[PDB]
Structures are given as C-alpha cells and as structure tokens.
Structure 1
Amino acid sequence: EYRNWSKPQCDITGFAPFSKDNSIRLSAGGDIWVTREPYVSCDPDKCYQFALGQGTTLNNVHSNNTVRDRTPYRTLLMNELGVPFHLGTKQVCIAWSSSSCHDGKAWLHVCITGDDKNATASFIYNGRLVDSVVSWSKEILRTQESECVCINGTCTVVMTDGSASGKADTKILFIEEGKIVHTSTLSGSAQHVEECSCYPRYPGVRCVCRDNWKGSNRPIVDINIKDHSIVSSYVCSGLVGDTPRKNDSSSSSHCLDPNNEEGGHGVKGWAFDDGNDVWMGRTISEKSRLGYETFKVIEGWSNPKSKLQINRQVIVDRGNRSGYSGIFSVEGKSCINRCFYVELIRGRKEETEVLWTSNSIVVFCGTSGTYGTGSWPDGADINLMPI
C-alpha cells in the first residue's frame, strides 16, 4: 500500500489546464482566507490544495499588513483541489513554513512555527504528532513549501536553517510514519538551497530548488532513499529559471556552480529532466514576479551552453502577477506524471490599492496529447476590492 512510484515518467509534450480557484475574486463577495506559499499534493485518489493561512479572512480588519511572513497565527490550510479556502477549511497544523506528502497510507505534514531564532518543526503523520526538531542554526528554520516525496514508506523533506544571503545549513530528513529516522547534511555542489520542488525519480527523489545567495540557475538536490546519500549541482540550462536573473541574450549557467548573475534573492520554482532535455517554468519578467511561462530546453539538463527552447507555453501573461510555483507528481495507470501550480500574488507591497497580501492559484498538468494557448491570471479587480 505504500507508494513506490516505480513507473517511468510520462511522455510530456507540454501541459494542459488542470485547476484554478479564483480565490481573490471570490474574496470580494465571501469570507475567504488570506494565504501565501500555496502548493498541491495528491493522495492516491485525489489532489488537495494547501496554503499558509494568515489567521484571517481577506474582508476582515486582520488582513492589514499580511505581507508579513512569520506570525504565530499562520497555519497550514488543506482542501480538495478546486475547493477555495472558505471558513470550513481545515487548519492541519501551526506553520509559517511547511511541506506535506502522502506515503500511500496516510498524510505527513512538516510544520514550522515559533521564534525566528528558535523555531520548531512538528512532524504530524496519520493525524497525530510523531516527532519534532528544533532549529539547528537559530536563523529561521524553513522548508520546501511544496510536497515532500515518499518511497516504500520513507518520506524525504529538505530543510534549511541559517543565512538567506550566505552559506546556510541545509539538511535532508528521512521520515517513516512521522518519525525522523535519519538526517543527512547537504553535500555536493549546490551552494545555497531553499524551497525545494522535489519529485519521485525511482529509485530516488530529485529536487530543483532556489539559490537565494549567488545563483539565478536553480540548484538540484538528488536524494538516495536507500543509503541516504546526497549529491547536488545546478540545472545546466543557459536559460535559467530563477527571478531575478539576466535576460535571455546575456544570461549563462553552470552545471556545478552558481552563475553569480543576479544571484541574490530568488523565487520558488521547479524543473524536471527528460533525458538530456529539461522542462522548466519561470516568471516571464526576469526582474519581477510578472507572468509565467513553461518550455523545454533541448539538452538543457546536461549542456550549460544550450539556450535552445521549444514548446513554450504562456501560463500567465506578462501583464499579470505570478509568484511561487512548484511541482507535484501524479501516478497514472502506466507512468508518473508531472504537474505544477502557480501562485498568483495580489496586494502589498507591489500593489498599494489594498492593505493585504494574498494569492489565488492556477494548476496545469503534463500531457502526452495536444493543447492550445491562453492566459489564466488572478482576475481580481484590485481597485474594487475591500481594502
């Protein structure tokens, strides 16, 4: 009954529309949670949307100044995918940073809350607290903000503690039925790792992450489930996936080093390999969280000089706000499929018409079929929203 994900990756020609929740538009005529850092994860039957609530609904005095990242009121929300975060939504744990995943039998939730310099991560499995760990470097323990990955009952989750603009202490935790059974330190060539988007790649787990220090190319962390070994590098592709970054004409990348091109800061993102090619998404603006696009870089997984992209799709047009994005994987009859969500951020600080900060989501899944074009932005009229 445990998931093992021992099927080949599906053939992927692109991505087709899967879900959208319209939560900000709904917020203007209904009681909807303020959120950020959303993600998607599916049990063997159905998918769920998650997000970090801000302990308030949008049309509510407490939505003021929800641009703040960490408060004791943030909790992890969980609904079936496509059900918006209404007041019946379950808060599954206290968290201003989270990861969740289903091992085939039950849900694991990794939830981080508490003091910036002395946070706690609770591990909740099958509806009960099984373990916890304290911040090891006293500098904002934080994790993936997207699904973890379980193989044969062993789940893995990437966690970082320490500087956001320098060497930090990243660890890969191995969790069985909610108990931390082993911990490995980040090893290899990735020099800064945050907010990993991880996927099953039998027999292991592979992650594409955020370098917040010197890289606008994304780190890769590869996790061996059996022997707990870790290796790490960077997505080779000369079309890089972080924001900020240089323009397509002047950017470059390395397979084993951060490129040092607009490296500081970043945004959660994702990519995955298909042979020597790489599928990746990124904002369309190279400086800001405007627009979202996907495409395949031919030999982009192994050749750091390639900028040869194909199969581009606009998900969110360049005139509209995007935000975080991350991967999740869905088991099919004969192959493992790859999907992604996009966070559509509205409000402060970039938009000052309102006092709050929140998001909606849109979701696409890989397809072996055909597909057209479009743009699926947030759609809320900020000028007519409650303040």
Structure 2
Amino acid sequence: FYWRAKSQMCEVKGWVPTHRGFPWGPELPGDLILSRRAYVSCDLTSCFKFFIAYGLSANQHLLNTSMEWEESLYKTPIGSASTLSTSEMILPGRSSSACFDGLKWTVLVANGRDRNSFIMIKYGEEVTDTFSASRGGPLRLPNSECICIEGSCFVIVSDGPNVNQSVHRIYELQNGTVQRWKQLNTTGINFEYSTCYTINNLIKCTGTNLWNDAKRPLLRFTKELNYQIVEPCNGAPTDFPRGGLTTPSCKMAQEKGEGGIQGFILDEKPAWTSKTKAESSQNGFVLEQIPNGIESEGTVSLSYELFSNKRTGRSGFFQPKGDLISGCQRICFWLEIEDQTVGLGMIQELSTFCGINSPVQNINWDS
C-alpha cells in the first residue's frame, strides 16, 4: 500500500520533454496565478505543480492585491495552466516540500521571519506536527519533493541566518509526524535547496552551496539516517554562477562560489550533470553523462544541449510513482524556463523532462 521505488533505476541514455512550460510572453492571459519556488510531485496516477503564488495577472499587469507578501502554497495538475479554476490553495507558506506516500500527501510549509519561523506538517486533511527555528531561523524547506519509502518520508530542513554558518537536518516523518531527525555535519559548506530521489532504499540529494562553492555538494543517506556528503570530482562546476573548467579533483570550486541556484546531479553510474550552456549567462541547459560516476575524473560521453539560448532557472528531480509498463524506476526533472512579459516582468514556467533508455538526437528545444 505504501509506495516504494521499483527495484532498479531505468538505464538513462536520453532525456525527453514530457511537458513544455506554457508558452506565455510577451503577453499572458488574465487570471493566471503567477508562481515561484515551483516543483513537481506525483500521486500514483498523475503529477502536480506545487508552488508559492505571488500574483494574479490582469490585462498584462498584476492585479493590485496582497498576494505577493501573503505567501501561500498552491498546486495545479501538470497539464493545466495555473488559474483560479484549476489551482488549489493548500497552506500558507514561504517555502515548502510535498510528497505522496501511496496513501496520503505529506506537505510541509515554513512561515514567519527569523526567530519566529516555524514549520507545520499536514498529512491528508490533518495538521499533524509543528516545530520552530532553533538556530535563529528562518527555517527553510527545499522547494522540491520530499522522499517517501514504505510509509516513511524524508526531507531536508535548513536553519540559521547566514549561509556561512547554516544548519541542515534530515527529518524522518510517518503520517506527518516527526519520528526522529539527524543534524548533518556540514562544517565548511552550505547545503540549500536539496533536490532528491530514491532508489534501492537510498535517498540521494543534490544541494546548492550559496557560500563558497560552485560545485554542487551531494548527499547520500539511508532510511536509518546514515549518510555521507560528497563533492563532485570532475572539473566542470554546475552551479550558477560559476567559474571556468578546472583540473579534475575532489576539491571545491571556490571561484564565484558565492550565490547559486537550485539544481541536480543524477548520482549514479553513469552519472548525469546539468548546467547552463554558458558560465557567463543563465542561458541554455546541458545534460552530460559521466559513465564512471560523479566521483571519477568526470570524462563525458553523451552530451545533450537541451536548450541553447532560452533563459533557464531552478531545476530538480521528481519521480513518477504509478508506472505500469516500466519494470524499472524512471527519473525525471523539472526546469524553470524564464519568459519576458510586457507588463509584469520576468515569469518562470516549469517544463519537465524524463529519462529514456534509448539515445536520441541532440535536439534543441529553444524552438
């Protein structure tokens, strides 16, 4: 009854778009709910976009409301645009995580500022738990799906006012109730915006180091909260911003390590990295396969420039949970595509891509 990943991950030799973002810009229709910090998560039947709403479109501008500073989490079926008719308001929240365990949705949101920040957890209809900042706040949820295995759901929560002394904990939940937690030893790094997937009883997450690294730190942990934090050992940093290519080593890429943006590394053998085409602008998106894994020298084989010029933002994992034909576990990612509008600035729309077990041509989806 509780979901768990299929026994092995599908071989990944390509990536195909299953959903392009709605093609808004320079104009968009009215009564659209404008979203940020969006991500994807699925029940056993279909997938949804979870997001924080910050405005509603009206004649190309923003309806004058308090939506921007009264922050609430919404969800919309992936195949629909986010409008008042198609989107459901779930809880108030500035950051969030959500995941379906096979029976019910567990949803976490963070509210309040600094020392007042607290997290609440909902399982189904029911608020089941809360906890407050303990290292100064704000508490921060990763804005990517949490990970459920056989009824236990895991999420990374971050605390602390400064990226140079952040605190990161794994929380284990059951029926929306904290069972235990483990504070990770992250001395010398920062680990925000965890995006994760699960395979053979392991949870693997990619972080974003906003302090002193342009490589993305990686976390591997078990259902028992045993863990290891790992550094990519190639010479191609994947955060944005970042410096240029370097000699492969397991060392941090400190050139332009400050700042960053949510992103992912498929931490398997082969591994896949993902990054902007250019180190100079947040444009394009490139997927590269590293057969010997992320802790090898990083020699690339397959390479796919999914976008060249389109402006791209945050990205992260989600996993289909109800496949019937596939005997192996599929892996997908979501990716913000940024569009310029005439009357309310830069918007982002999520597209989604899933791994396939066959190679395809190096199609450019810029269109």
What is the TM-score with the length of structure 1 in the denominator? 0.86
Counterpart position of 2:155: 157
Task: Tell me if structure 1 keeps the 8 A contact 2:285–2:312.
Answer: yes
Which whole-Å CA distance do the structure 2 matches of 1:123 and 1:26 have between them? 38
Write the deviation string for residues 11-64 of structure 1: whole angstroms up to 9, x where unpaired.
110111111231634962332111112111111111111221114336444479
Q: Structure 2 stretches of 5 or more lacking a match?
A: none
Cα distance, 1:194–1:41 mapped onto 2, change above 3 Å? same
Counterpart position of 1:264: 258
Q: Percent identity?
A: 23
Cα distance, 1:222–1:273 mapped onto 2, change above 3 Å? closer
1:316 to partner: Cα distance: 2.2
1:185 equivalenced with 2:183 (yes/no): yes
After alignment, is 115-124 or 140-149 more displaced?
Answer: 115-124
Which whole-Å CA distance do the structure 2 matches of 1:41 and 1:190 have between them? 32
Superposition RMSD in Å: 2.4
2:333 to 327, 333, 340: 340
Write the deviation string for residues 156-175 of structure 1: whole angstroms up to 9, x where unpaired.
00011124430211111111
1:44 equivalenced with 2:28 (yes/no): no
1:292 equivalenced with 2:285 (yes/no): yes
Counterpart position of 1:239: 236
Write the deviation string for residues 58-114 of structure 1: whole angstroms up to 9, x where unpaired.
644447999xxxx64221221111211111210111111111111111111111122
Counterpart position of 2:361: 372
Q: What secondary structure does 1:336 align onto?
A: coil
Q: What secondary structure does 2:75 align onto?
A: strand
One-letter code aligned to 2:359: T
Which whole-Å CA distance do the structure 1 matches of 2:162 and 2:19 have between them? 32
After alignment, is 185-194 or 233-242 more displaced?
Answer: 185-194
Q: What secondary structure does 1:262 align onto?
A: coil
Q: What secondary structure does 1:335 align onto?
A: coil
What is the TM-score with the length of structure 2 in the denominator? 0.91
* Aligned pairs, number: 362
Counterpart position of 2:220: 222
1:13 equivalenced with 2:6 (yes/no): no
Which whole-Å CA distance do the structure 1 matches of 2:232 and 2:358 have between them? 27
1:143 equivalenced with 2:105 (yes/no): no
Task: Tell me if structure 2 keeps the 8 A contact 1:141–1:160.
Answer: yes
Task: Tell me if structure 2 keeps the 8 A contact 1:63–1:356.
Answer: no
Q: What secondary structure does 1:286 align onto?
A: coil
Counterpart position of 1:385: none
Counterpart position of 1:362: 351
Q: Structure 1 stretches of 5 or more lacking a match?
A: 380-387
Cα distance, 1:253–1:345 mapped onto 2, change above 3 Å? farther
Cα distance, 1:356–1:117 mapped onto 2, change above 3 Å? farther
Counterpart position of 1:301: 294
One-letter code aligned to 2:331: R
After alignment, is 259-268 or 233-242 more displaced?
Answer: 233-242
After alignment, is 94-103 or 180-189 more displaced?
Answer: 180-189
Task: Tell me if structure 1 keeps the 8 A contact 2:5–2:329.
Answer: yes
Cα distance, 1:222–1:313 mapped onto 2, change above 3 Å? same
Counterpart position of 1:316: 307
One-letter code aligned to 1:21: G
Q: What secondary structure does 1:137 align onto?
A: coil
1:174 equivalenced with 2:172 (yes/no): yes
Cα distance, 1:260–1:103 mapped onto 2, change above 3 Å? same
2:73 to 76, 84, 93: 76
Which whole-Å CA distance do the structure 1 matches of 2:162 and 2:333 have between them? 25
Write the deviation string for residues 191-231 of structure 1: whole angstroms up to 9, x where unpaired.
21000111102212110110111111111112221x22232
Counterpart position of 1:326: 316
Write the deviation string for residues 126-183 of structure 1: whole angstroms up to 9, x where unpaired.
1221111112222322121111111111100001112443021111111111001111
Runs of 4+ deviating beyond 6 Å: 63-66
Task: Tell me if structure 1 keeps the 8 A contact 2:331–2:354.
Answer: yes
After alignment, is 361-370 or 111-120 more displaced?
Answer: 111-120
Cα distance, 1:221–1:287 mapped onto 2, change above 3 Å? same
Counterpart position of 1:102: 100
Task: Tell me if structure 1 keeps the 8 A contact 2:55–2:65.
Answer: no
1:240 to partner: Cα distance: 1.9
Cα distance, 1:287–1:252 mapped onto 2, change above 3 Å? farther
The residue correspondences of 1:267-278 to structure 2 (distance < 5 A) are: 267-275=261-269, 277-278=270-271
Cα distance, 1:264–1:178 mapped onto 2, change above 3 Å? same
Task: Tell me if structure 1 keeps the 8 A contact 2:30–2:57.
Answer: no
Which whole-Å CA distance do the structure 1 matches of 2:104 and 2:66 have between them? 36
One-letter code aligned to 1:288: S
Cα distance, 1:376–1:151 mapped onto 2, change above 3 Å? same
Which whole-Å CA distance do the structure 2 matches of 1:228 and 1:120 have between them? 23
Counterpart position of 2:82: 85
Q: What secondary structure does 2:24 align onto?
A: helix
